[PDB]
Each structure stands twice: as structure tokens, then as C-alpha cells.
Amino acid sequence: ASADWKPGHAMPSLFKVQNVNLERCELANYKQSIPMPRGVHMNIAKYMQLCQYLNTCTLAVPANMRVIHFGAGSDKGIAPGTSVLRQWLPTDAIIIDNDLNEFVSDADITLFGDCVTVRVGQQVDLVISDMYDPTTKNVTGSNESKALFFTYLCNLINNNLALGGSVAIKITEHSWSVELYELMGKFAWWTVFCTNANASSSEGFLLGINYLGTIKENIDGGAMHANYIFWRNSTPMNLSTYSLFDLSKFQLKLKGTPVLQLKESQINELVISLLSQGKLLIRDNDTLSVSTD
Amino acid sequence: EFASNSSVLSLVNFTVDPQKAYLDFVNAGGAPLTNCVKMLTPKTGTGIAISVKPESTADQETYGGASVCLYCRAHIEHPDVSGVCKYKGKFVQIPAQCVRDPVGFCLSNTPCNVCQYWIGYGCNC
Ligand SMILES: C[n+]1cn([C@@H]2O[C@H](COP(=O)(O)OP(=O)(O)OP(=O)(O)OC[C@H]3O[C@@H](n4cnc5c(N)ncnc54)[C@H](O)[C@@H]3O)[C@@H](O)[C@H]2O)c2nc(N)[nH]c(=O)c21
Ligand SMILES: [Zn+2]
Ligand SMILES: [Zn+2]
């Protein structure tokens, strides 16, 4: 069956249009685990499947592509997801990664500390976040929108993301943000992608594909998270890493996406259409400067 | 695992020759460093030692390079005169028979300066 060979499941518009109360997420295989192929870190499989799904999206893939990776430490001091990004991305891509505690990584630039200490001076092309705050596990009252590191990520989307750029931001049943869902309405397209390697978690990567800087879809973020949970509650997802059995086409396509500087007023129908097809980025072409503040 | 890694990584901070310290430690039966970043790859690569993308043959495994570098892992100074690590940001191919100790393999061997295959494990010059 084909589902197992896909890298994972993407939230369909069937559930995006529902109108339901936010309910508890109850997964029939909750916390079931799948042994890892060749005993690589679980995050190898998880990032590879995220990358495989993004290979089907209209990502902009320019020369000198600017990628920032938050929450990049894992498995006590290493960064397997960053190495997967290095395997996936063009060889001239620039990877900046960040996490709270010290770790060793194959990124070009590695910054330690709170994500708020990460000062992006320019605009980037792709944001990956695997951040999750441990206090989210202390479930007490109702499940409300969280601030935490999402405030930082929302501001980054509004200020430090190229038009045409994209984002993949980890959320869970309880780790989520109204404001971040609503920002998905400023992209050409959006979804939540759940890997098959971690299908037994309410984890999903909230995907914003091709940033437009203007509202395309009016989203009620609290309602949309209720729809995401309704989708998870409705959708059998069996653990699987079959998508990784054939890696012959894994690398990100070398699209040579152009980078253009344009004033806001010059953005017309043609430009929006190119941005929405993954065929253009608008941002500075200076030298990227991303440091600790 | 973490306690054991912490041990040998601590040990190579008490020495003037971290390479020899590591090799002497594992040669005497000490636990090799674990938690190296093994990649999944189509085992259809060229088989060279160090590569910008994974290049493992059917007889190799590919690791993320920082994770098999003793100096990166131990957070100590790199011996290269340029200061730049030779592995970090790249991928390192390890013969499949040596995956028990990728770091020790790397400290014990040298890419051929002419063909960039591991001398003794690929270099045919
Ligand atoms: C989806 N779900 C949540 N809960 C309950 O609600 C609580 C909060 O739910 P959550 O938002 O954390 O979602 P979930 O439990 O699915 O998250 P999971 O543990 O899989 O973590 C997802 C990712 O977050 C990160 N993460 C988890 N814990 C930490 C941590 N302590 N530190 C850093 N990262 C962490 C890791 O990337 C991890 O892969 C859970 O701790 C559990 O009591 C459930 N209970 C049942 N019985 N069935 C469920 O299906 C269920
Ligand atoms: Zn190093
Ligand atoms: Zn040679």
C-alpha cells in the first residue's frame, strides 16, 4: 500500500475547511516507536522525510541559499538534522543553526543560546524549526495558544524572510501558536506535514510555502489548530520509513532560482505568480550576517 | 553511552596529543566514541574519503563529518595549520568493517593527497 511508501501525510483541504472545537488529540498508536534503519538517529529519518516532502513543494532554491535551522541540537550534543540538511541542500547553501545548549554540527555557522539571541541582519530563504519547550509537557488547564519561541518566529517571518521563502516549523498538540497559523495565510500555500517515521506523535511541521508578504487566505489560527487535531484524530497513520529505501532522488533540485531586489510598489501580478511557483525570491543580495546579540 | 562518551572526551582534555590519547585508549580496550552521525545514502557514490555530499560505496558508510572529528567532538583546538577542520560541514566515508569506531578510523588513516581515497581503503596509486 502506497501510504507506507510516502514520506508522511500532509493536512488536506478537507480538514482545513472544517469548523470544530479543539479536542484532545488521541492517537491509536500514541508513543509507539519504530526501530531506525541501520540504527541511525531517529532525527535522520524524520528530517529526511521532511526534506522528501519539501522536494514535492515549490521551494525557491537559489545559489548561495540561506537556511536557518532552530532547535538543531539533539541526541546529547550533536545535530543529525543539520547533517541531513547538508546532504539535501545545494553544496553552496549556507546553513546557520542554533539551539540552547552546546552541540557539534556540520552547519556553516552555529550559535548557542535562546533563539532570541540570533540576530538575522538580512533576509533568509528557508527557516526550519525543531524547537519545543519542555514546560509544554506540564499540561494543566485548557490547551491555549502558546507564546514561547513562536513570538520570535512570527517576527522573523514578518521581517527576515525573503518573499518566495518558505518555513517548516514543528508544532504539536500543545506546542502551537494562533499567530503562526494566521501567518500561513501570507504564503502562496501552507499545510502541516507529519512524518511517517514519527507518525505516532502529534508532532507536525507547519509549512509555509513561498512567502508573499500579504494576506492571501484569512485564517483563524485557533480554529485551524482545532482542525489539525481533528485531522490527526481522523487519519490512520502507520509508522514507516519505506520512503527512505530508495534515496536516488533525495537531493533538493538545483533550480537556480533568481534573487531580485524590487520595491513594494513594483510587485505586480507577474511577480506574485512567479513567487507562488517557486520561481523567484525577492530580498537583498548582500553578504549574509547572522550573529549572536 | 553519554556517560561513556563524556569519559573518553574528558580524557583527551588531559593530554598534549589527543590523537594518540584516543588511539591508545581504544587500543587498550576503551569504549570508542559513540553517537556519530551515520547517514542513510544510496550506496552508489565514488567512495572517496571526504566529500561535500555522501559518497559511500556498497562497502562503506557515510557520517556527518563534525561528528567523527575528535577535535570537534571534544571541543578542543584543531591541529590543522589553517585552523579549519577537514571534516566539519562535509561527509566522511568509513569502510563498513570499521564502523565500530569511526573516530578511531579517522585518527588512524589519511586520505591520499593525489586521489583523495583513503590510503589502504581505496587508494590505488
Ligand atoms: C498527542 N497526545 C498528547 N498526549 C498527552 O498530552 C501531553 C502533551 O502533548 P504534546 O504537545 O507534547 O504532544 P506529544 O505528546 O504528541 O509530543 P511528543 O512527546 O511526541 O513530542 C514531539 C517532539 O517534541 C520534542 N520534545 C518532546 N519532549 C521534549 C523535551 N522534553 N525536550 C525537548 N523536546 C521535546 C521532540 O522533538 C519530540 O519528538 C503528552 O505529554 C501526553 O501527556 C497524549 N496522550 C495520550 N494518551 N494520547 C495521545 O495521543 C496524546
Ligand atoms: Zn573538527
Ligand atoms: Zn591515491
Q: What is the 3-state secondary structure (H, E, C) of B5-43?
A: HHHHHHHCCCCCCHHHHHHHHHHCCCCCCCCCCECCCCC
Residue pair B104/B36 in contact by the 8 Å Cβ criterion: no
C-alpha of residue A30 to centroid of ligand 1, in Å: 9
Which residues does residue A112 pair with via DSSP β-bridges, in sequence order?
A99
* Cβ neighbours of residue A68 closer than 8 Å, sequence gap 6 or more: A95, A96, A97, A98, A118, A120, A124, A126, A127, A128, A290
Using a CB-CB cut-off of 8 Å, the residues of chain A touching B52 are 91
Torsion angles phi and psi, residue A204, rounded to 5: -150, 155
Which residue's CA is the closest to the ligand 1 atom numbered 25? A132
Q: Is B70 helix (H, G, I), strand (E, B) or coil?
A: helix
CB A170 within 8 A of CB A191: no
Q: Which residues of A touch B35 (CB under 8 A)?
A: 75-78
Distances (CA, A) of A241 to A14, B71, B90: 26, 33, 25
Distance CA B26, CA A264 (A): 61
Look at strands A124-129 and A281-282 and give their pairing. Answer: unpaired
3-state class (DSSP) for residue B73: helix
Dihedral angle sign, alpha carbons of residues B113, B116, B120, B122 = negative
Whole-number Å distance between alpha carbons of A171 and A177: 8
Half-sphere exposure of residue A144, counting CA atoms within 13 Å on the CB side?
6
DSSP string, chain A: -HHHHSSEEE--HHHHT----------TTTT---PPGGG--HHHHHHHHHHHHHHTTT----TT-EEEEES--BTTTB-HHHHHHHHHS-TT-EEEEEESS----SSSEEEES-GGGEEE-S-EEEEEE----GGGG---SS-PPP-TTHHHHHHHHHHSEEEEEEEEEEE-SSS--HHHHHHGGGEEEEEEEEESTTTTSS-EEEEEEEE-SS-SS---HHHHHHHHHHHHHH-------GGGS--TT-SPP-----EE---GGG--HHHHHHHHTT--EES--S---EEE-
Report yes or no: A115 and A285 within 8 Å, Cβ to Cβ.
Answer: no
**C-alpha cell read off for A29:** 498508536
Residue B95's H or E segment, with its range, is: strand B91-95
Which of A41, A76, A102 lies nearest to residue B37, judging by beta carbons?
A41
What is the nearest CA distance from A82 to chain B, expressed in angstroms?
9
Largest CA distance in chain B: 42
For an interface test with B, the pick among A52, A67, A86 (most B C-beta atoms closer than 10 Å) comes out as: A86
Core vs surface per residue A35-68: b (16+ CB within 10 A) or e: ebeeebbbbbbbbbbbbbbbeebbbbbbeebbbb
Amino acid at the residue A165: G
- Give CA–CA dist A259/A253, Å, rounded: 17
B118 three-class SS: strand
Cβ atoms A130, A167 nearer than 8 A: no
C-alpha cell at A79: 545535530
H/E segment holding residue B44: none
- Write down all domains in chain A, each with its CATH number in brackets: 1-293 (3.40.50.150)
Is A39 an 8 Å CB contact of chain B?
yes
Q: By the 8 A CB rule, do A97 and A131 touch?
A: no
DSSP reduced 3-state for B71: helix
The bridge status of strand A187-195 relative to strand A161-171 is unpaired
Cited resolution, angstroms: 1.8
CA distance B78 to A248: 35
Residue numbers in B near A38 (CB within 8 A): 38, 40, 61
Residues B117/B123, Cβ–Cβ less than 8 Å:
yes
CB A45 within 8 A of CB A253: no
Q: Is B107 helix (H, G, I), strand (E, B) or coil?
A: helix
All cell numbers assigned to A5:
511508501
**Does residue A213 come out as left (phi exceeding 0), alpha (psi in the -120 to 50 range) or beta?**
left
Helix, strand, coil share (%) of chain B residues, nearest 5: 30, 10, 55
Query: How far apart, in whole angstroms, are the C-alpha atoms of residue A285 and residue A55?
Result: 24
* Residue B76, all three cell numbers: 578542543
| Contact A102/B at CB under 8 A | yes
Of the candidates A76, A83, A108, the beta carbon closest to that of B37 is on A83
Q: B102 and chain A: CB distance < 8 Å anywhere? A: no
Which residues in chain B (35-74) have CB-CB distances under 8 A to chain A? Answer: 35, 37-42, 44, 52-54, 61, 64-67, 72-73
**All residues at 6 or more sequence positions from A287 whose CB lies less than 8 Å from its CB, including other chains:** none
Closest ligand 1 atom to Cα of A30: 50
Contact A54/A217 with Cβ under 8 angstroms?
no
Instruction: Estimate the crossing angle of helix A80-88 against helix A42-55, to 10 degrees.
Output: 30
Q: Which residues of B touch A244 (CB under 8 A)?
A: 40
CA A225 to chain centre: 16
Query: For residues A106, A112, A115 and A117, what is the CA-based torsion angle, rounded to 10 degrees?
Result: -130
Count of CB atoms situated within 10 Å of the CB of A31: 7
* Residue A166, strand partner residues: A126
Residue B4, H or E segment: helix B2-11
| Binding-site residues of A for S-adenosyl-L-methionine | 43, 81, 99, 114-115, 132
